[PDB]
Design a binder for this molecule. Structure first.
Ligand SMILES: Nc1ncnc2c1ncn2[C@@H]1O[C@H](COP(=O)(O)OP(=O)(O)O)[C@@H](O)[C@H]1O
Ligand SMILES: N[C@@H](CSC(c1ccccc1)(c1ccccc1)c1ccccc1)C(=O)O
Ligand SMILES: [Mg+2]
Length: 333
């Protein structure tokens, strides 16, 4: 049973300039989201949905991390494979939540930036939790992006972001794949983190100037792999592996093969259709095990609070709510 949560961003300055009204109410306690749907015609009308967790407009980055990620990171350290992906309309906060942003000027260090998202906070915790705990461990990260069914490597040594990756079925996993050419960087300590992310963002910036509407049409896949040593009571040394995939999806409002097959894959699972079209898109092949497989999965549905985005917001809520019916069978590696 996959976890689905909703995060509503606060109004932006443009919306206030236009006197935007709010049509969203979040109730963390009852874990519900209620939408005002009749504007001027019917003031009482509304659509209420129930999710595993709800975060209102005032929710801060650190709140999302403590509530959603902490539990997931524990599962990863326990030797599980987990996936968190953001789904939502362009401009609602997918990237802001998954990666976050850097505060202007010095002001804050990357480890203390209030605006930092899930990726930076997670990599920081991995080193903090595992170091102040003993345990021999090694951390490896990768960041690829899908655009028009083509795969680009943001952490690759080559200076040209357009050099393409390839995908193949993983011989040792019926529902897993191998990314040929992918650069998996070993992160020796937290002091090596920021440089890797900074290089990553730089190559992404170059890619957005190379392809049309890159930022909103692409899918971003960040993966973290942890190898940890365990010694049984008998003195046997073995290695448990934990893996975390942090995915920032293309805008739902929508080169659309992956987003399209994703919806198709979800529908097939909730309706129990015989054949699930995983093979039909680069995205669903990478996430196959996350959708009905052995990976612990959580979805963060992002929405705007404005009356103007009513239709899309309802669409996002409806889509994410169906997703609650997808069942997975988590299994340690
Ligand atoms: N919780 C939030 N608090 C403040 N601003 C937010 C929040 N969520 C999103 N934003 C704003 O929305 C904009 C980014 O949205 P964005 O990350 O591009 O959404 P997405 O990646 O789905 O398009 C940013 O300019 C940021 O200021
Ligand atoms: N959201 C920003 C990146 S924020 C990011 C980052 C986070 C994850 C992966 C790569 C970069 C960053 C921004 C600018 C320079 C370096 C890194 C970031 C933000 C806050 C703390 C750590 C990393 C973007 O879309 O460009
Ligand atoms: Mg984005």
């Amino acid at each position: 049973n996959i976890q689905v949560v909703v995060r509503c961003r606060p109004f932006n300055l443009a919306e206030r300039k236009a006197s935007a009204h709010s049509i969203v109410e979040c109730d963390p306690v009852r874990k519900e989201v209620s939408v005002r749907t009749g504007g001027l015609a019917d003031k009482s009308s509304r659509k209420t949905y129930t999710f595993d967790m709800v975060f209102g407009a005032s929710t801060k980055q650190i709140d999302v991390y403590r509530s959603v990620v902490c539990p997931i990171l524990d599962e990863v350290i326990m030797g599980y494979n987990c996936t968190i992906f953001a789904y939502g309309q362009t401009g609602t906060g997918k990237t802001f939540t998954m990666e976050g942003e850097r505060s202007p000027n010095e002001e804050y260090t990357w480890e203390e930036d209030p605006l930092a998202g899930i990726i930076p906070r997670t990599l920081h915790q991995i080193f903090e939790k595992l170091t102040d705990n003993g345990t021999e461990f090694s951390v490896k990260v990768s960041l690829l992006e899908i655009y028009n069914e083509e795969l680009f490597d943001l952490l690759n040594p080559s200076s040209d972001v357009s050099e393409r990756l390839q995908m193949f079925d993983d011989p040792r996993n019926k529902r897993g794949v191998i990314i040929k050419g992918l650069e998996e960087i070993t992160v020796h300590n937290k002091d090596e983190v920021y440089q890797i992310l900074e290089k990553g963002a730089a190559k992404r910036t170059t890619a957005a100037t190379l392809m049309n509407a890159y930022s909103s049409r692409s899918h971003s896949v960040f993966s973290v792999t942890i190898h940890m040593k365990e010694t049984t009571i008998d003195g046997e040394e073995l290695v448990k592996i934990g893996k975390l995939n942090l995915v920032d999806l293309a805008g739902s409002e929508n080169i659309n093969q992956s987003l399209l097959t994703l919806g198709r894959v979800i529908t097939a699972l909730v309706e129990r259709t015989p054949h699930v079209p995983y093979r039909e898109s680069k995205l669903t092949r990478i996430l196959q095990d996350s959708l009905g497989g052995r990976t612990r999965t959580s979805i963060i549905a992002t929405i705007s609070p404005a009356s103007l985005n009513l239709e899309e917001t309802l669409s996002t809520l409806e889509y994410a709510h169906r997703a609650k019916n997808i069942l997975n069978k988590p299994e340690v590696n």
